[PDB]
Amino acid sequence: ASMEMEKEFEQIDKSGSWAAIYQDIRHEASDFPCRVAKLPKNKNRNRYRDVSPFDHSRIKLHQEDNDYINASLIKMEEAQRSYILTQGPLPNTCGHFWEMVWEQKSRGVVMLNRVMEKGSLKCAQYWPQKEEKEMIFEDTNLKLTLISEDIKSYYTVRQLELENLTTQETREILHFHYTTWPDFGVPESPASFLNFLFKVRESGSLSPEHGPVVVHCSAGIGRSGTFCLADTCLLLMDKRKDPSSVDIKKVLLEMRKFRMGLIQTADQLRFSYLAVIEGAKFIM
Ligand SMILES: O=C(O)C(=O)Nc1sc2c(c1C(=O)O)CCNC2
Ligand SMILES: [Cl-]
Ligand SMILES: [Cl-]
Ligand SMILES: [Cl-]
Ligand SMILES: [Cl-]
Numbered sequence: 159a160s161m162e163m164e165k166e167f168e169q170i171d172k173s174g175s176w177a178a179i180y181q182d183i184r185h186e187a188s189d190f191p192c193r194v195a196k197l198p199k200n201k202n203r204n205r206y207r208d209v210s211p212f213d214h215s216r217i218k219l220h221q222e223d224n225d226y227i228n229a230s231l232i233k234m235e236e237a238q239r240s241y242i243l244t245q246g247p248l249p250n251t252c253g254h255f256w257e258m259v260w261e262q263k264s265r266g267v268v269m270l271n272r273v274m275e276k277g278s279l280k281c282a283q284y285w286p287q288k289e290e291k292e293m294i295f296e297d298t299n300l301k302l303t304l305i306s307e308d309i310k311s312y313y314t315v316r317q318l319e320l321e322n323l324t325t326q327e328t329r330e331i332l333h334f335h336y337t338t339w340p341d342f343g344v345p346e347s348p349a350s351f352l353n354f355l356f357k358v359r360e361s362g363s364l365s366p367e368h369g370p371v372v373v374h375c376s377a378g379i380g381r382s383g384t385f386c387l388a389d390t391c392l393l394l395m396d397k398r399k400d401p402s403s404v405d406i407k408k409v410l411l412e413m414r415k416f417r418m419g420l421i422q423t424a425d426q427l428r429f430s431y432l433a434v435i436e437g438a439k440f441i442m
Pocket of ligand 1: 206208209271280341342375376377378379380381382422
């Protein structure tokens, strides 16, 4: 790999067994309890009833009334990278979302969806669109201000100021918004996906000096899983002597120990292969 991975890719392509391989992954994936996610009191904190964090990896809010947020810590030990994957916040969980960003000391938020997709609400408007209209989250005592945005053709980078209204301490949060990645679909090219990923890496947001980057789409599993799988596989291919031993299927199953349903379609799995192959070549 890239040679060994590319060879494997062409073989799967030739036999047309992407769907078969993807289904194998779903069958083999971990099935851990999500008791807390499924408590009655948490019903309104979940966007989709079929998408919940495992108890063992769920992010806990440091709040005395209810610690629950639909978010999971994905800790890739060998790759030496962590991510927080979470659903697109609901109108009632935006305060929670930013409480999590604050408490976990994250530097970046990666958003891979749009607020409305095909006429359906997929994510709350959880950040301010206008500088002069800041957002105040009274429940978690946080204020959020748009400082600037860098709008590119297929993604936007925003500078946000998150302020703890209790202490008046402020932090700069980078918001990386992929705006042309359709739900249950794939990016328009490996190149544009990789350019985006590299921008996130270059920002320092994935650095161990900060808390884990927060990654989300609508459910925090399909597009989110695709993004994280590619990043981790690229790390492995660069850190392993004999990078040929990087088995994307095994890495995805390792990730799914931490959150269910990562990568939601066979074509997203196929795209992950392409991204990793093309990216390996660029980095090598
Ligand atoms: O946003 C994504 O990329 C993603 O995984 N979305 C998902 S996963 C998922 C759903 C959705 C959705 O957006 O409707 C609906 C219920 N089943 C699981
Ligand atoms: Cl949007
Ligand atoms: Cl919503
Ligand atoms: Cl591997
Ligand atoms: Cl699945």
